[PDB]
């Protein structure tokens, strides 16, 4: 039970990190793919097209 609890807690932390990464990826999709972003160094490096 201690081993399973450790595994579940580590999986929860990793899932939170994956959630943050997926939210960042969805934001990058919605900005750079569906339009042009004026934010510097958000979509690649330099002036984004």
């Amino acid at each position: 039970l201690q081993s399973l609890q450790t595994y579940v807690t580590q999986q929860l932390i990793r899932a939170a990190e994956i959630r943050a990464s997926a939210n960042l990826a969805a934001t990058k999709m919605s900005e750079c793919v569906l339009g042009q972003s004026k934010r510097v160094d958000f979509c690649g490096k330099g002036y984004h097209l």
Binding site: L12, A22, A25, V33, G35, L49
Partner: protein
């Protein structure tokens, strides 16, 4: 920097550059049978575990919530547009060549060449439980292979979205970006020549469109060279996909 109160530097040319960014989306959806993992159908062990309470139900609920959250992340990162746009049969986008990124109709899988390289790069060669669980699906020639609970109840759930529909969504996004620009994201798709889209995206960064209309051939050649360089770098032995491998 040669700084002064009356000196400025103005570029005389430019270089179109294509870079690669890799971001993780989802993880492996794993479900654990707590009672099976604790013991192998021992009724005395089950009776002793029932004295502890609702630990196994809580862990199963947490794992189910994790899997549902992974599916929600994939759906919210890929199903941005509900209109599945198709690529035009004739491709004359001002000399720009998108053959490396467009889907290939010559294969049952709708993945592109670059997508095929990405799929071939990431592998489960030296993995442990995941590769052993996936090998049971390649061992279907032998009957009576109950590999679902063979590893003490540790199961791997298949994703809600498979690779084919994800590739279809990416192809639809590429078609909407090429044919409609940024208009299809806000609302209904508006067809537009690719030169107009390049001109207005040049205008969005403070560059007049006559630069594009005078150097379109050079811009297309530089873009094709950058696409070829990206393809050659991805096809090389460099481990550029280490983020998903982690």
């Amino acid at each position: 920097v040669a700084y002064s109160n009356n000196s400025i530097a103005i570029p005389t040319n430019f270089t179109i550059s294509v870079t690669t960014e890799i971001l993780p989306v989802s993880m492996t959806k794993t479900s654990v049978d707590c009672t099976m993992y604790i013991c192998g159908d021992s009724t005395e062990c089950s009776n002793l575990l029932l004295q502890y309470g609702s630990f196994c139900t809580q862990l199963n609920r947490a794992l189910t919530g994790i899997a549902v959250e992974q599916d929600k992340n994939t759906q919210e990162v890929f199903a941005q547009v509900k209109q599945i746009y198709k690529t035009p049969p004739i491709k004359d986008f001002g000399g720009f060549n998108f053959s490396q990124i467009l889907p290939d109709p010559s294969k049952p899988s709708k993945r592109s060449f670059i997508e095929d390289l990405l799929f071939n790069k990431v592998t489960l060669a030296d993995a442990g439980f995941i590769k052993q669980y996936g090998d049971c699906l390649g061992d279907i020639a032998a009957r009576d292979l109950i590999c679902a609970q063979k590893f003490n109840g540790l199961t791997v759930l298949p994703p809600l979205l498979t690779d084919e529909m994800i590739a279809q969504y990416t192809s639809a996004l590429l078609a909407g970006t090429i044919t409609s620009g940024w208009t299809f994201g806000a609302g209904a798709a508006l067809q537009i020549p690719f030169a107009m889209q390049m001109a207005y995206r040049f205008n969005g960064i403070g560059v007049t469109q006559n630069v594009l209309y005078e150097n379109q051939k050079l811009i297309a050649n530089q873009f094709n060279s950058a696409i070829g360089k990206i393809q050659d770098s991805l096809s090389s032995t460099a481990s550029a996909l280490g983020k998903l491998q982690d």
